[PDB]
Design a protein around this ligand. Structure first.
Ligand SMILES: O=P(O)(O)OC[C@H]1O[C@H](OP(=O)(O)OP(=O)(O)O)[C@H](O)[C@@H]1O
Ligand SMILES: O=P(O)(O)OC[C@H]1O[C@H](OP(=O)(O)OP(=O)(O)O)[C@H](O)[C@@H]1O
Ligand SMILES: [Mg+2]
Ligand SMILES: [Mg+2]
Ligand code: NA
Ligand code: NA
Lengths: 179, 178
């Protein structure tokens, strides 16, 4: 099983000086194009929550779609996107979050979460945690419970794991990197 | 399976007056939230291409990610995203195309397609075909072969099916609204 976590971690490329000089980017697209690593990653996430009682999966636009939706399929429960603004056609609510250079919002359909839903949030990557903190507020405003957030990659030095742990969320990541 | 296509079709909500007055929007998110409809749509798409010899699946950001990637996982081939600009970190090429109110681009990683790749394109929705024509140009510039494009929903009145058929693309759509 280490076999597998190892094959998943090796499949992810590290790009130097991206997005800027000095900084490393962990590129999930190289996992996406290795069908062994990709299927293993969805198999691990879905087996870990198999007995969790989750009734909805939420995945945040856009890379989170590529993990949240296969997990939802493997679990046999509904998938609910949280999207960038102006894309969801039915009635929505919104939360604002901080980017490096200003602020943006995420939206969810109000009809798609309801009281008593047990919601697993899935994203490719956990860094500062701003994205998921916003997503978790969307879900809780509609009466969903979130106690679990799952990721392919964690960069615990950026603080997101500690930040989400403090907000009642058990973070589960397949691999992690540091400097 | 008629039974199944009807279940998929009825799972998709029609939204009146979106994005504006007079216009109808087919909302695939109601399908995503019905696990039976969702898994069935992925089952039909992957089984249709099971013997096609496909080596890569491309899905265009963002809604195509929701159908191209599960299709890739079912075929057991790699998935390659085509993205909005500035999101892909390795070397890319780019293709410009028309929106209603101006011009945008789609990018692809140059290392993710090679000569002799056999590439299925998957998207949620075929309307005018603009998006997919651009996508296809990305793939072909890298030596990739594309002869199939697949969709959940086709809106043939908007001309995309015919447009793409003209470009050597065989279009396969689960359902149609008219
Ligand atoms: O934990 P945080 O610091 O919020 O960072 C993690 C988030 O950032 C990235 O998304 P991004 O908005 O760059 O783009 P994408 O998902 O559209 O590719 C990644 O996909 C996570 O959603
Ligand atoms: O056949 P065409 O006329 O090009 O239209 C079809 C495309 O338009 C929509 O994309 P959009 O950029 O609104 O957003 P999304 O995929 O990010 O939701 C849809 O998902 C298809 O990609
Ligand atoms: Mg993201
Ligand atoms: Mg699209
Ligand atoms: Na609700
Ligand atoms: Na190439």
């Amino acid at each position: 099983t280490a076999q597998q976590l190892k094959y998943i971690k090796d499949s992810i490329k590290t790009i130097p000086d991206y997005p800027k000089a000095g900084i490393l980017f962990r590129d999930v697209t190289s996992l996406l194009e290795n069908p062994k690593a990709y299927s293993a990653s969805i198999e691990l996430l879905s087996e870990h929550y198999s007995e969790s009682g989750v009734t909805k999966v939420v995945g945040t636009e856009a890379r989170g779609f590529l993990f949240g939706a296969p997990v939802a399929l493997a679990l046999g429960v509904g998938f609910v996107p949280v999207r960038k603004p102006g894309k969801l056609p039915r009635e929505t609510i919104s939360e604002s979050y901080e980017l490096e250079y200003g602020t943006d919002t995420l939206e969810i359909h109000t009809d798609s979460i309801q009281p008593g839903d047990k919601v697993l949030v899935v994203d490719d990557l956990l860094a500062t945690g701003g994205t998921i903190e916003a997503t978790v507020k969307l879900i809780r405003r509609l009466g969903g419970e979130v106690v679990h957030a799952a990721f392919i990659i964690n960069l615990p030095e950026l603080g997101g794991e500690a930040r989400l742990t403090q907000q009642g969320i058990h973070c589960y990541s397949l691999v992690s990197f540091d400097g």
